[model samples]
Target chain A: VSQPEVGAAIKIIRQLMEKFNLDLSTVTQAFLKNSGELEATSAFLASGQRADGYPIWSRQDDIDLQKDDEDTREALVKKFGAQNVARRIEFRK
Target chain B: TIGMMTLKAAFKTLSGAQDSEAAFAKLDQKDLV
Candidate 1:
C-alpha cells in the first residue's frame, strides 16, 4: 500500500530525463508502458518515441521552438545577453 | 554516461534490498492502484 519504492524509483527516471532531453511525465509514462522496466524505458526514451507512439521533437525542432520570438531586440537580449548581442552583430556587418 | 551510470547505480541500490518486482509493486500501488 505504501509503495515507497515507487518514489525512490522515480529519482532514477528523473536523472535519465536530463540525459534524454525528456521530462518526468514522458519518462514516467514510458516506464509504465515498459512494465516499469528500467532498461526498457531508457531505450524507449533514447529512441525519441513518446509513450503513445508519437515521435518526440528532434534537437533541430527544439532549436526551432527556442527561436520562437518576441521583439527581435528582446529576444536577442534574453538569448545572447545584453550588449554582447549588439556588438556581435556589428562584427558580421 | 550519467544516465546509464545512475540507472545502473539504481539497480545496484535496489538489488541490495530487493529487485524489480518489489519496485514495480510500488509503482503499481502509486499509479494503477
Candidate 2:
C-alpha cells in the first residue's frame, strides 16, 4: 500500500513543524515537495525486489518501528498513542 | 497505462469557467446554483 509512504511523509512534516516552531504555510510547501518526492520513492518502496535486498524504511510492517528511538516512540505514544499511527488513515479512507 | 501515467504526470488543473466575482454579482440580485 502507498499508505506508509504518505503517512511517513506526513509524520516527518508534522514533527518538523512542531519541533522548529515553523510556520504551517512553509511546512505546507515543504510537505507538497516532500510528497512529490515521496511519490517516486514510494514506487521503489513498493517494488518487492531490490538489488541488495536490504530492508528499507518504508518496508517496516510496524509503523512505530519508524520512530527515531524508544523515547521518541514513547513521546509519540504519550501524545497520540500507539494505536493512533494506523488511525491516521482511518478517516481518509 | 499511458493514460494513467499521463494523468499522474501533473497536478495542476484549470478551466474556462467564469470567475467567482463575476458569477456572484449576478447572484447578488437572485439566488442561484
Candidate 3:
C-alpha cells in the first residue's frame, strides 16, 4: 500500500537539510508531510538507511511522557514518525 | 487560507521565548493519567 500525493517552508527546510545532511528535495517533502516538526523529521533522516531492508523504527524511540514517571523536562516534545504513526518524545538537553 | 502548508515558526518571531521553556514544562499538569 501507498499514500497520497503531496506536499512547509524554504528556510527551515534548508536548515534541517544542513543539520541532517540530506537532499533538498527529499527533506522538502519530508518536512511537508510531517507538518514541519523539527526533531521528528530529524530522527527520521538520522535513522534512515540507503539500502538495508532492515527496521529503522523502534519501540525505544517511542517515548511515553508519563506524568507519574520521570520528570526532568529536558526533551519535552513529541516526535511523531512519518513512516509509522508511532509518536515519541525528546532534546535541548 | 491559501491552502498551502507552511511552518508557522517561519512566519516570524512573535512573542518572547524566554519563559516559554518553563511554561511548556508545566503544560498538561492535570491532563495526564
**For model 1, how does the per-residue alpha-carbon lDDT over A1-93 read when each residue is reduced to its tens digit?**
123554467477667778887644456545543444465457676764434333322233224334646675575466445543443333212
| lDDT for each candidate structure | 0.46, 0.34, 0.37
lDDT of 2 by residue, A33-55 (tens): 12223332233233432223322
- lDDT head-to-head 1 vs 3, winner: 1
Off by over 4 Å in 2: A31-93, B1-33
TM-scores, one per candidate: 0.35, 0.25, 0.32
Model 1 agreement with the true structure over B1-33: per-residue lDDT tens digits: 122223334444444555654553443235321
C-alpha lDDT of residue A16 in model 3: 73
lDDT of 3 by residue, B1-33 (tens): 101223223222221366533432332121211
Clashing residue pairs, candidate 3?
Answer: A75-A90
lDDT of 3: 0.37
Please provide, for model 3 over A1-93, each residue's C-alpha lDDT reduced to its tens digit, 9 standing for 90 to 100: 111212125455567778877655456444433334565556567765312232322223323333334332233332332323322221111
